[PDB]
Amino acid sequence: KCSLTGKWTNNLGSIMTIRAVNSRGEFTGTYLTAVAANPGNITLSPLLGIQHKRASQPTFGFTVHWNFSESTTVFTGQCFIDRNGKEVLKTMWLLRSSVNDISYDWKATRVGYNNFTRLS
Amino acid sequence: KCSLTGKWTNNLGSIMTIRAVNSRGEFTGTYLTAVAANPGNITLSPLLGIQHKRASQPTFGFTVHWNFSESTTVFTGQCFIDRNGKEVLKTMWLLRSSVNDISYDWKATRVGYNNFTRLS
Amino acid sequence: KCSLTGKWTNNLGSIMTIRAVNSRGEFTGTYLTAVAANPGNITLSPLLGIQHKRASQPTFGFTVHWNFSESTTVFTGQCFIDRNGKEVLKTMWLLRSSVNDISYDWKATRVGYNNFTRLS
Amino acid sequence: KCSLTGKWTNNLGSIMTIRAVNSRGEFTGTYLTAVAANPGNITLSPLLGIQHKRASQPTFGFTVHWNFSESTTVFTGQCFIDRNGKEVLKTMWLLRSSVNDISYDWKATRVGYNNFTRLS
């Protein structure tokens, strides 16, 4: 089985720490991105999400409120376990930037992927 | 200022109800989707997310844990206020399906948009 | 049957003109975007794509090579015919920006939607 | 400099062959996917796209008309060269499925990534 609780890194070098997942699958944590619009100002940012509880390889989602910009990122994906018991989070994300008014909305959303593995 | 608290409907007919937004911008609520893979199964499902607090037109994200499938959806977007004071949520979403193993991961994520306005 | 040949406009005000669709479903045309990173620079830009041929409501894709930037956009979607014979193209797109090197790749892709209807 | 001409594989084991890129950056090719909705019926499928010509690390897009389903995929990305002269295509894609009518459009588009390297 695949809890999101613990410490993770991704293919870009970011790290995230997730606290205990509650009975509803809800979790909180802290995200340190290796990458931003401007790296010189990166600070720790809170995350909040929900995973499925019963599934051995659950799907999940979470939101990161960036504490150093007006942007928000959401991640969704699935936790997989291989034959050796090794976990990987396979995720896709959307990064929403703040734009001035609705006529700029079209350009406000970036998309990408991330693969996370457990630290230690 | 744009607070996500309240009831909203989107362009597909779905309805969501967001409760109080806390000091950190965290919020919970429920989501009744008009659409699903198997609509006969649809039930009210919980959401959890974070919005920015200081901005008049905040970005935000939330996760919906579907209570009737193994899937998860994340939404991110921005709340805009027009010159008449009307609020629109412009969002993009990712819908993560559960797949049996990692070899099927490539096909597990759908993408789309939704525009939300207030029920009343 | 839905042939992409003709002039179309989208929900952002952009206009495109598609030429004859060949036996394979290949088509070329031009795209005049209403929106860009630097709108002062916008010029008419070429597109090239393929639609399915046998289907009444074909899926399709096309690439727009922006003639005024280093970016590229791809659109994919489906042409629907409603009960009155009116055609709508429902599309999603990815806009790829040029970045200086691979360390910036993560932020180079935007996503969005567009709905197109015929000019006349 | 980064021509798309040649033979490529991606992280899912798919292979594609691209013919000579013309003076406008247009190219044709053939795509053999390792993965589909149903693999037992996979056949070679044509692709058609445009790359930028002047840039050393050009952006590009192309469309794959699947010859064994009603779907279409578009890819966009950038060709990067490292210090050793090794090329990688970093791409994102949208896979459009055919749905019966416009009320099902919401679920019709999958998103993902692929990294391609040159064969040989």
Q: What characteristic shape of chain A results from the CA principal axes?
A: globular
The main β sheet of chain A shows up as: 8 strands, antiparallel, barrel
Question: How much helicity do the residues of chain A have?
Answer: under 10%
Strand content of chain A: over 45%
GO molecular function (chains A, B, C, D): biotin binding
Protein name (chains A, B, C, D): Avidin-related protein 4/5
Subunit structure (chains A, B, C, D): Homotetramer.
Domain Avidin-like (chains A, B, C, D): 1-120
Q: Any overview of this molecule?
A:
It is classed as ligand binding protein. Keywords: avidin, streptavidin, AVR4, high affinity, pseudo catalysis, ligand binding protein. The assembly is tetrameric. The entry is titled "Crystal structure of apo AVR4 (D39A/C122S)". Chains A, B, C, D are Avidin-related protein 4/5. 4 copies of one chain form a homotetramer. Chain A is mainly β and 120 residues long. The first copy, chain A, has an 8-stranded antiparallel barrel with strand order 1-2-3-4-5-6-7-8. In chain A, strand 2 and strand 3 form a beta hairpin. Helix content of chain A is 0%, strand content 50%. The first copy, chain A, is built from no helices and 8 strands. Chain A has one domain: Lipocalin (Beta Barrel). Chains in contact: A-B, A-C, A-D, B-C, B-D, C-D. Chains A and B meet through strand 4, strand 5, strand 6 and strand 7 of A and strand 4, strand 5, strand 6 and strand 7 of B.
